Amino acid sequence: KQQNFCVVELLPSDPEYNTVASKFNQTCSHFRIEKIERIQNPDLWNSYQAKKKTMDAKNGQTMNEKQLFHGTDAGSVPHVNRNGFNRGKGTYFAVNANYSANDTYSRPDANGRKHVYYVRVLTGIYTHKNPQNPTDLYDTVTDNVHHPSLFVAFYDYQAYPEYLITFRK
Amino acid sequence: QNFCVVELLPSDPEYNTVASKFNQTCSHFRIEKIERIQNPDLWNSYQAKKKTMDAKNGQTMNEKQLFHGTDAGSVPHVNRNGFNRSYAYGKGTYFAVNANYSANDTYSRPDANGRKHVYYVRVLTGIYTHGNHSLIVPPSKNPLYDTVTDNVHHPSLFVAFYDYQAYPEYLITFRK
Ligand SMILES: C[C@H](c1ccc(Nc2nc3c(C(N)=O)cc(F)cc3s2)cc1)N(C)C
Ligand SMILES: C[C@H](c1ccc(Nc2nc3c(C(N)=O)cc(F)cc3s2)cc1)N(C)C
């Protein structure tokens, strides 16, 4: 599985577009969206979904998945499109787009453009598990359990980079 | 102008054709992957401009495969748009006969992980002349040329000024 990918542009006339634009614009209405792309990566998607089938069957009534934001520099984009966020070693995801929208994470490129993904993450059972069963770990960690602003994933195929929002100041 | 990026296997005949050409001047580097870029609209727009050109320049071989180094940031932009507008022998996109020119750190600028990127590009060089810094557009053949170059009888580079004049066919990712 060498996880090739395709990049389709979401058009304003797509029902998926309002939803991503809305969620993004909750915190980032002062940026202007240049475009939104759907990242299509079959091997990566299947691998993500396999982790989820498992995770759904193990965590009972827990809703394992959330859609979160991750900002990154323009040069990491092909790497994320192909390999996701694969490879104690964590990748950060924001609940709100403004956080990911920071220059430290979404480094503005030569044309001024910034890149934040709208990401499907398997947050599962998280804390800020069992002494009797020490090989049993939390799926993610957060900054605050009752009112989270971020999540940290560690394992492979735990997140799919479904949408890429390109924008500027 | 959506696109796909297919990674080639070293087993692939294509992979070796591209690797051979790159290694002629750049064998001292380590190739990590060679991907093929599939952008149907851009490819179409290129083949149209080529149909026009092969019908214009008689016996001329209009097409050359040249190299182009760039930073990791530009890769998604090139994949989608080509070498289009937003990108001392004229104000266009420069392309090299030999990989090692493109492999210069100022063009194929090393990323965070030390990875360099060089396209192997189909370019419609067509009929070309010697170029100059105040160009912006090709000279007229008589008081219009397709590209310009540094030296007309032994060219080492080429400069294109229009869109759809080149297709970013392969991407070569490598390191020192
Ligand atoms: C670029 C990459 C890297 C980049 C950033 C970080 N740190 C962090 N990133 C984030 C993001 C975000 N959208 O990126 C969002 C957050 F709410 C918190 C953090 S902490 C850690 C690693 N590095 C592995 C090279
Ligand atoms: C780094 C990259 C960039 C791309 C092109 C240039 N200008 C120039 N590039 C080249 C290249 C080449 N392989 O790209 C090859 C040459 F024989 C001459 C020039 S001049 C300068 C920077 N990016 C900023 C667009």
Burial of A87 (0-12, 13-18, 19+ CB in 10 A): exposed
User: Could you tell me which residues of chain B have a Cβ less than 8 Å from any Cβ in chain A?
Assistant: 2-7, 9, 71-77, 79-80, 86, 111-112
Residue type, B147: T
Show the tokens assigned to B136.
């912006």
The CA distance from B15 to A122, in Å, is 37
Overall resolution, Å: 2.8
Within 8 A by CB and 6+ apart from B134, the residues are none
| Method underlying the structure | X-ray
Please indicate whether, in this complex, the C-beta atoms of A74 and B73 are within 8 angstroms of each other. yes
Shortest CA distance from B9: residue in chain A: A2
Contact (CB<8Å) B2/A2: no
Fold of A1-169: Phosphoenolpyruvate Carboxykinase; domain 3 (3.90.228)
What is the number of other CB atoms lying within 10 angstroms of the CB of residue B113? 11
A138-155 per-residue burial string, b: 16 or more CB within 10 A, e: under 16? ebbbbeeeeebebbbbee
Pick the CATH number of B1-176 from 3.30.930.10, 3.40.50.720, 3.40.50.300, 3.90.228.10: 3.90.228.10
Give the closest ligand to the alpha carbon of residue A110: 2
Both tokens assigned to A16: 């998926």
Does residue B161 sit in helix, strand or coil?
A: coil
What does the angle CA A67 – CA A12 – CA A29 come to, to the nearest 5 degrees? 60
